[PDB]
Structures are given as structure tokens and as C-alpha cells.
Amino acid sequence: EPTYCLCHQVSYGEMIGCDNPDCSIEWFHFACVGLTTKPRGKWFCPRCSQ
């Protein structure tokens, strides 16, 4: 099973993809990045946003 996110765990629940094509993680669990609902438009992760 592939792992994802800042937390390095398997996919679960809703996930969000980072819009930096060079992102090293790519997919994140909503709660790990402080989200309850889908943001509109492009989104970048905390490592990409700084």
C-alpha cells in the first residue's frame, strides 16, 4: 500500500492534491493540512506554500 502526506500513512478519507507539479508528496489527508471542505481553485501544500 503506497503512503502519502506529511504523516506518511496510507490513503484514507478525502485527499487533496498539491498543484506544484514538483511537490515531493503530492497527496495529503484533508485533516493533516487543516481542511474540512474542498478549497476552490489551485491549492498548494504547506511545504510548497512555505
Binding site: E14, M15, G17, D19, W43
Partner: peptide, 6 residues
């Protein structure tokens, strides 16, 4: 944003 359900 792009999202998926597991």
C-alpha cells in the same frame, strides 16, 4: 482544488 475520496 483536486480532491479524491479513498
Amino acid at each position: 482544488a483536486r480532491t479524491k475520496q479513498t
